[PDB]
Amino acid sequence: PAAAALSDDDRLVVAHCAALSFPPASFQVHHASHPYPCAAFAFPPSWSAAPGWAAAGRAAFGDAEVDPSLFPSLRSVGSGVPARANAAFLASFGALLDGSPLQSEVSRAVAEEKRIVFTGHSSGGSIATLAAIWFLETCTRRGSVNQAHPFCVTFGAPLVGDNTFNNAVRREGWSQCILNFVVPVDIIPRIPLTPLASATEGIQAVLDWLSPQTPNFSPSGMPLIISQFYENLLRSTLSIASYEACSFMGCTSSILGTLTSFIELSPYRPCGTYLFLTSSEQLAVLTNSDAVLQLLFYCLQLDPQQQLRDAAERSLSAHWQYEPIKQSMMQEIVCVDYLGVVSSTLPGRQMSSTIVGGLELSKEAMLSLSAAGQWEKQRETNQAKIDGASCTKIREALKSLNEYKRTCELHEVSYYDSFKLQREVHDFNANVSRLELAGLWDEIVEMLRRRELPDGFESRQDWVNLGTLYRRLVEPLDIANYYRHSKNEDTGSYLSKGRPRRYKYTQEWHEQSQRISFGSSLESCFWAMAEELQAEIANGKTFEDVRDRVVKLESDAHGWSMSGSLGKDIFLSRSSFVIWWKTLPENHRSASCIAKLVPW
Amino acid sequence: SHETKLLERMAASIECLSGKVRECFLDLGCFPEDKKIPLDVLINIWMEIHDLDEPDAFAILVELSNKNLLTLVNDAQNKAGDLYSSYHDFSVTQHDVLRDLALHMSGRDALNNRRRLVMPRREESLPKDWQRNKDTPFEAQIVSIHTGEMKESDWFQMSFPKAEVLILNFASSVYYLPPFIATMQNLKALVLINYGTISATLDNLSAFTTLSDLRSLWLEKITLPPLPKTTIPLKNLRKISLVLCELTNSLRGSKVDLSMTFPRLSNLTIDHCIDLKELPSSICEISSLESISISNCHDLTELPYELGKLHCLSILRVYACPALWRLPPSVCSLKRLKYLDISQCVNLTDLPEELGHLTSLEKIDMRECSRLRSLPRSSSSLKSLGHVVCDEETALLWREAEQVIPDLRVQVAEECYNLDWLVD
Amino acid sequence: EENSMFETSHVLGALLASSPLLARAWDRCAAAADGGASSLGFVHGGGGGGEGEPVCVAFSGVQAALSAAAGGGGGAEIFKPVGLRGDAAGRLFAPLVAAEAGGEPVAVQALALQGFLRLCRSPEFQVLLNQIRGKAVVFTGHSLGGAIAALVALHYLCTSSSSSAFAPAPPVLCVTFGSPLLGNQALSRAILRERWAGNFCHVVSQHDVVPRLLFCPLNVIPVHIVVGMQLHQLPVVVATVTARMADTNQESLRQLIQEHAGEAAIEQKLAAPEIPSGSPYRPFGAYVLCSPDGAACVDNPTAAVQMLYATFAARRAPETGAVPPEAAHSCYGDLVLSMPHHLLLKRRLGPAASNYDVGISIALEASGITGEATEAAPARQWLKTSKRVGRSPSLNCASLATRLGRITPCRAQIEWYKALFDANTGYYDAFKQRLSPKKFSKANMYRIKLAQFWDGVLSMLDTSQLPYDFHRRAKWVNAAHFYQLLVEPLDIADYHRNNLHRTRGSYITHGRERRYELFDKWWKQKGCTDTARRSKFAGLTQDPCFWARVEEAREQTESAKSERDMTSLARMLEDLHKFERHSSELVENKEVSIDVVAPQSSYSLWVKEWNELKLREEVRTILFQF
């Protein structure tokens, strides 16, 4: 990860953001020309548990779905599952977009050719993360891809998002644009891990202590509710860390599934690059999300001789210690990698609580970090195998099927009709190639479901183009196999009930790349809609009852033929569609949008 | 017409080739029309007729096939070009026009006392012209007969003093051997291919006693009658080919010393034997045997225990035998073995532990042996293996043996699917 | 290898300890122990958080212990195992024992069964069962009563499958908070085969005697000490039971139970079912071995026994006095309060080969064993035996996908063979009659290959090398359904060609393969968890066993053609009429393939023979009454 190292321009930007966040709704605009012209948008923090942090809802964690209009890419490409985030934080950002003039200010800086950045402290930095993603979505959708990527600098921001949310940003490649500075003893980033709505009194109490405006001059000291809340926070952090630890370690126990329904697990996961402030001269940089989550707990373990009241006081005061970042960033700071150093350490040797980058971790912490590092290496190894023998075999099978299509096209027949009959040896050979292709593609889909591959696999143009070619050449063959075995009379329609998941995944990959409406690229599944129409017309229904569906089919065929996505074997004067069309009533045939594409 | 405009061109092209090649072309023409011709029987009859025991017969066959004169059908799952395995996996198919030209060339000779007598028709009765010319028996070396259900009364007196081979193609449930089969004193090969969909029996067994100097036999779809106590020594017999023959345990009840009935038998081939529980142990008492080939037998449960008594076997080809599960230990004590084939043995649990004693072994074929997942350690002592064909799963097993034996080569072969089974 | 493998038991133990579920369970257990002398069970309560917290129900079996102590111990008299299929009431555990054949039925402890029956007598228990229906229930309890709770939990789950016809069953978790062994290995196998072992937990103290005293043979089992330990939880026969405590050597008793546990912990490796001298009691579910340092969760029953023996054998320093069973069984609250505190402490360390060894050592220290003692030397090796070696199940499924893709062309060739003979006789009759042997051999080869591949898949499933959700995936279940519907008639033809129906028995009852039954169950579950008339005959027959029924009907008709006894022929004609009606209904809906309606198919011949038999006056008279 060479991108982990911070360039001199990046360090200067971070130092400028720190000054604005910690000066010596109401967003602030700051313009600076050092090192390059830039505009900074600061977001004030929130010191209210409700509705600032937790809204009014029956959910125990305050999670809500993301608005599709504002964030159309924050979703699972394969399955279409929308991402989730904090309800209060999402609502606050939406108010700024509609009410605040922030939408006008960000456009002006773009017109000034200035790279924009987002900065914030505590809950303010959480909103800045959403703002940076929103700017990325607008630029990506339009043709202005030359715009500079936003810089999201956060200082101790609470965890916001979900597993789907974290996966989406990594797939696009926007994780490098988000920088998170977190003190190892800070308590604020770990607050979302404990249930927020269930325990609001404790959250409000600690927020009042951390609020600079709120006076905190209790003669006795920290209230007992805060001390009790700290103990519950540590226990809650242990539960979520342990549950996620078994995921990448290989536990696979039948009791884990049942325990999920009986214990409360926080859905929030770390997102972006995290830079732990281990010391003044060192800055641990971690990019793996799993490693960051483990570090959030093992860095708060109690000392051998210390009370929970004393530990809570240090954690509370650590939230207001990000000020020396600006002064330290001016000089060179060793950006020592943490996952590499832990992995480089020999097993057994130096297994004690060594410095290991300045943070004296525990024995279980070393094992957890090592397991997380090996999990990342395993995923890279799986991609190498898929990109090797598997990729070569797919291309050879496609070449064989292309020749079969060419051979049938020379006899003025469609390869769809020929495959449906399955008369000669050529049809059998095509069937063998189709079965081999299905197995190779299913392995890729199966591994993607369980996250055994890097998040950027679905964004590579080589695989997207290969999937489109595979879909637009073999789907009609699969449709013919479905209807030649009379599988539509015992299960259902091809487009409704029985459709391979691999074709759905490939279609969604192509739609996302071209930024088109989802579910509109149905050119491959053209014969399926035609066969169903021919089935209904012969099941008792008349043409007048289904003429509404016929004209929709004709309109889609005309539009696809203009772009060229439509197959060239549909109007070869000997296909089933051409013969069926001529048998239609003369009134429809006389006035149709495909009256000239047919080989009359 | 086409006889002089086009057929005469092919006749003149054949006339360019002189002697052995032309007579080989005529012999191929005499074979049944549109029928798959195994390579082994064709090579055997060529060696018998033209004395081409040397590989010059193979060279002549290659030269003939190089001029688009005969089609050499070759199995797709074959990694050997012109090896011993390929020598028993090919087939020869001739074109109709070339066969018609050969028939015209044969008809150029006299009707009687010709060199080759062929009747290219499916008429149930015997040819009337041959009956008219039955007064003067012919001396044709090759005679072709194509009749349906024929009984003893449906025959008349023929003789062939100089004949060495005869082809009999028929389709019926029973058959009676014609009396004139007792006329050739130098008959060397007999063909009894049956087109009947039902199993066909044979009659006139005493005629087999009259047969002498016979060295080849190719039965197909024929129910083998039980062998009686009578010796009937076919001393000159060397090769027997049984394809789709239902023994019906007739040889099970026969207890005759096979060292005298078939003393010079060398090659035995059992193909597509539908009903065969176990081969008799008497076949282990023939020391002259050198090539056993059991193919597509789904009922053969166990090989004979005393298989090592042969002490002369060189090629063992037992493939497509799902019922077989273990190999007899005596196969370890079988010197001079060079080609072992256990391909498509789906239910082969393991190999014998004394495989190391199998010296001079050169090629092992264990393709599609899914159950076989362990190899004996003695296999590391085979200092003669040079080529092994097997799947990828057993490649890891052979990875240990390939280090000890430097010249050992492991070839990975994948299953191939075809639709030829329907063609027939 | 070892460097790439990590130990996960301590992580699961920490996850269990961090959650307040154990604390709430112990609070309910203490509430029951404080005055549950009434016939009604412990107060359900719910905790106020009906949605946030699942309903927590405790079960104290002190009254059952008093009833047992009234009749005295006698020696195994209260510990004699009792079956479920034959004895007691099989209605409660019909899904548990509806197929029992091996080493006795599932069986259960007599005292736990008596307590369960006593609880079932009270209508308030049934009312509470009705109230908690459709929700999540946490079943707790201390000592034998906890085991009783487990039984109750089982019963609840044993009925949940009845209610969860379409939707998945609600999650119910039982803890039993430390109880003696309930069932033998048969019960554990029955629970595991139902995918039902993940709903039970067990927390056992390091030096507790009750959870491990059942390891000794039943003839020497100290019933008195266990019944008195249960009695001790009651607030202050009782004098006589407490008198048995004093007249018992703690050191000698510890020696006996340690010897018995050592004898029983190594018998698994030397599996000798011919010599079942030891007590049949075996643990089930997952055991959370707890200690003041921490916890360790073990799921392998053999590893559970090994770890239990290791942790009891490993004694603390001799300066500590002999641990009394009362304190050992009555200190669980202190441990519940202590383990999270110790797990939240960053204890500084004061030449490990690999990370796996470090994890094993950490788990052993959390389990409470003494590192300096020699008992840790075998236990580590035991911990190495429990862990499985191989690739992840996800990669196994990914490889199996391409394996199935490569094997499918055999099924395509079988389909071609079937389509070849679909116009004259049918592929079933052609396969049975072995017509065209040159193609029958190829069909048999492909069938054998497909059967071997599917048997290998099933064997991989049985070993637990595949994901638990394998049977709930559309691709695998539909592929299995296609393979079954296409190949099973060939298997039936092969079975009936060897005349196995007259020797082995009926194919549907005894001759059917486990693979086809599993595939049918998978299809049925898929249909439940998730019509226009067919204008043409289906490609494949919907009923995979239709041909077996046809053969049975033909045999019955042939027998009836010669049967003379009116009483027998009446029932055989009734069965023939039932099958004729079923076949007519199937044909009218066109749910059968065209090869069934083939002119020379066996179905047409059977129909002709049945009509000829019906033409008989006696058959017509018999059918007229029916």
Ligand SMILES: Nc1ncnc2c1ncn2[C@@H]1O[C@H](COP(=O)(O)OP(=O)(O)O)[C@@H](O)[C@H]1O[C@@H]1O[C@H](COP(=O)(O)O)[C@@H](O)[C@H]1O
């Ligand atoms: N009635 C059915 N019978 C048998 N298989 C079916 C049926 N309906 C769908 N399928 C297949 O089941 C898979 C769904 O699992 P899916 O991939 O979504 O994964 P999950 O849902 O578990 O995550 C898809 O591949 C469907 O493939 C289509 O059906 C033909 C099968 O023919 P084939 O056996 O030669 O392939 C193919 O031609 C394709 O038209």
